[PDB]
């Protein structure tokens, strides 16, 4: 193989080796073994002269380590030398458990582990201070000093200066300072709506939150656990600043009224014993009590429900049926092939082996949409039974004779609803696409199947409002701008279908601006900026702007971008973090210019340092609020600041 030659091995970090040599780009992680374990990752430089090797664990300092790289062998020792330290400029909550002062040692990525530093013969001391230098009681136990970094639950809000000192036992101390912020991170909820618990049905310790469940996990419908089961939240909806939203799990607290019935560890609940217990779910300062029952009766399949429960299907055609399988508590039950015996009627409406209700799909436990194909013409009821022959549910199937007497252009959401208008309203905030199909109907007006769109064409009669294309046997209409658009389905220039789709898009915008009353500046050393014309509520990040009237009611604040290339961008801060990001709405731009007749040599287009008046400044600054700074005619309002520094007489 390739010549890879190591000239030096050094443990540079608790989990990493640094190799020096040649051809190290040809080394794989498997080629390096430390104390019997192969490395987990290797990152060589582009010249192959060095490589960082990630180990599957931490190393004990001052202990002999045997490192093997291919046929080469080395004996090294980790000498942990703390040379530098960086205290993170983090923001913490004024009332939250599990918070610690973070810091990084040397050029390491990721936070230092105080417990590991203690095992590595290093002691750590934390010293909190108010910005005025006086002690700050923010550490655990209402204290100004700490040996762990853990913060107290109940800290007075403000800014703090914290010092971390790391000292090698019987050696030198390395220390640095940092500024942390104590804010109200808490979710400002006014109400708790839906609280969805999910069973950790496969007992793997994982219950997804804010996404589809995995494995055997299912969302509970009821408030019943069986003794020995474990559960966790899949979602909690709270009303935050007038809008319902899925709360961040880090903001939820869950307490049990009876730990011997249901115990809680980090919002993961365990059914300890049969009986009752109330779970108090806390988001911010608002709570919801959920009364649970712990039973001794294992979940058994009791119900198989079909939607639709009466299927009218054309012979040889396939139609979807959604099956919901449930337990004695009304909770989802994952039914495999053997769980349900599908007893087919002797009229032959469903073919032998044509219906197996299997409801074990991850993310969809207890629910499955399955195609039912019309076999022999007639009527009959499929009965869903368990092993003991008990009836769990049923599906009536009417198989109809096939032909084609009508082809109707229909919304896919209204498929098989004879005579329903294909005309629809498409809201671009909920969805950007709407799907259609050419539905075939029998002479008895029974929905058969979609028409094969091979040879057909589709056209949007207003390309700016929406686009329309044929994807398989569907017409996909893609909405772009508000307005009404006609979609035409044709074949060889003959009309097969027409639909009118009204595209709408409501977006909050600036209706008007209330500027502050401004006066002529006759004096020197006066600072002029955005705050001279717009009422600001100061922030450490982007400031809040008052007087920006919007087209819609909202509890979110209007902010302006403080610095950077996007300085002056006004936006609705929908998540409340004083930074333009995620689902914030751009409302417009604030700009400043000096008029053509101005004599302001120190003028700057910076909204926060526009001008500081000096002797014989004379001119006019125009501050504008526009929907877009690049379109001068998109101006919503302006306010001028008149500058006339008085210096008379001046012989």
């Amino acid at each position, epitope marked *: 193989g390739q010549m890879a030659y190591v000239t030096d091995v050094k443990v540079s970090e608790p989990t990493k080796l640094t190799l020096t040599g040649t051809g190290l780009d040809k080394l794989s992680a498997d080629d390096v073994t430390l104390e019997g374990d192969k490395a987990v990752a290797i990152e060589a430089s582009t010249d192959g002269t060095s490589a960082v090797v990630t180990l599957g*664990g*931490k190393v004990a300092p001052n*202990k002999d380590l045997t490192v093997k790289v291919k046929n080469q062998s080395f004996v090294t020792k980790f000498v942990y030398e703390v040379k530098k330290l960086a205290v993170e400029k983090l923001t913490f909550d004024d009332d939250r458990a599990g918070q610690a002062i973070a810091f990084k040692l040397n050029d390491e990525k990721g936070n230092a*582990d105080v417990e590991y530093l203690n095992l590595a013969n290093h002691d750590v001391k934390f010293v909190a201070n108010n910005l005025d230098g006086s002690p700050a009681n923010i550490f655990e136990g209402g204290e100004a000093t700490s040996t762990t970094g853990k913060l107290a639950v109940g800290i007075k809000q403000g800014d703090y200066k914290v010092e971390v000192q790391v000292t090698k036992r019987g050696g030198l101390t390395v220390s640095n300072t940092g500024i942390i912020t104590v804010k109200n991170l808490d979710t400002p909820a006014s109400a708790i709506k839906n609280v969805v618990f999910a069973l950790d049905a496969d007992n793997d*310790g994982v219950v997804n939150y804010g996404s589809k469940l995995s494995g055997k996990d299912f969302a509970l419908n009821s408030q019943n656990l069986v003794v020995g089961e474990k559960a966790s939240l899949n979602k909690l909806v709270a009303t935050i600043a007038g809008e319902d939203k899925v709360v961040d799990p880090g903001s939820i607290s869950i307490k049990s009224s009876n730990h011997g019935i249901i115990s809680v560890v980090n919002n993961y609940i365990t059914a300890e014993a049969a009986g009752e217990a109330t779970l108090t779910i806390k988001v911010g300062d608002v709570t919801k009590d959920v009364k649970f029952k712990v039973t001794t009766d294992s979940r058994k399949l009791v119900s198989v429900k079909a939607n639709p429960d009466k299927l009218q299907v054309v012979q040889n055609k396939t139609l979807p049926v959604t099956f919901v399988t449930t337990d004695q508590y009304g909770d989802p039950f994952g039914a495999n092939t053997a769980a349900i015996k599908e007893v087919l009627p002797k009229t032959g409406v469903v073919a032998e082996g044509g219906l197996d209700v299997v409801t074990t799909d991850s993310g969809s436990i207890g629910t499955k949409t399955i195609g039912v194909t019309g076999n022999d013409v007639g009527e009959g009821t499929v009965h869903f039974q368990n092993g003991n022959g008990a009836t769990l549910g049923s599906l009536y199937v009417n198989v109809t004779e096939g032909n084609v007497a009508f082809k109707n252009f229909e919304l896919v959401s209204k498929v098989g609803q004879y005579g329903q208008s294909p005309d629809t309203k498409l809201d671009l905030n909920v969805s950007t696409t709407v799907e259609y199909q050419l539905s075939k109907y029998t002479s008895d007006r029974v929905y058969s199947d979609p028409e094969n769109l091979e040879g057909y064409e589709v056209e949007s009669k207003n390309l700016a409002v929406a686009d329309a294309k044929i994807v398989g046997n569907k017409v996909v209409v893609t909405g772009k701008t508000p307005g009404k658009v006609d979609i035409h389905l044709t074949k060889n220039g003959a009309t097969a279908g027409k639909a009118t789709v009204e595209i709408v898009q409501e977006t909050i915008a600036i209706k008007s601006v209330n500027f502050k009353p401004v006066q002529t500046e006759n004096f020197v050393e006066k600072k002029i900026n955005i705050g001279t014309v717009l009422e600001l509520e100061k922030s450490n990040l982007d400031d809040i702007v008052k007087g920006i009237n919007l087209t819609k009611e909202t509890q979110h604040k209007v902010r302006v971008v403080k610095s950077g290339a996007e300085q002056g961008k006004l936006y609705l801060d929908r998540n409340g973090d004083a930074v333009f990001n995620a689902g914030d709405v751009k409302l417009g731009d604030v700009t400043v210019s000096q008029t053509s007749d101005s004599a302001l040599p120190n003028f700057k287009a910076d909204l926060y340092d526009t001008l500081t008046t000096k002797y014989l400044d004379k001119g006019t600054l125009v501050f504008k609020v526009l929907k877009d700074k690049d379109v001068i005619t998109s101006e919503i309002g302006s306010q001028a600041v008149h500058v006339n520094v008085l210096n008379n007489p001046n012989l």
Partner: nanobody
Amino acid sequence: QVQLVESGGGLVQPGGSLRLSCAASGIAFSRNAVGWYRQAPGKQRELVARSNTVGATNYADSVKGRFTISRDNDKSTVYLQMNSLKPEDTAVYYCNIYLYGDRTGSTLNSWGQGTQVTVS
């Protein structure tokens, strides 16, 4: 704060099996190799098995083939399947992190109470 909760020890006859469990906390579980150690009465402590951050295992030649260690990052738990128990495995078994270069876990500061394994 470091927490190490052992369980699964029993008064099983020779040849039997024991499912040893360990619920860990405060030891940077997913960022460390974990392992089971044992201490006989009036004898030194030795590392019986270890499992690194990716599940790669190592065993003392005294217990190879008979012992298999497993870990679960989602539950921060360590398991030890004790197949074909010989009297020579008479010890109180402890679970802890494993630091490369240590071998006997002598450099570690916090240990749990262990779980007694008695094979007659």
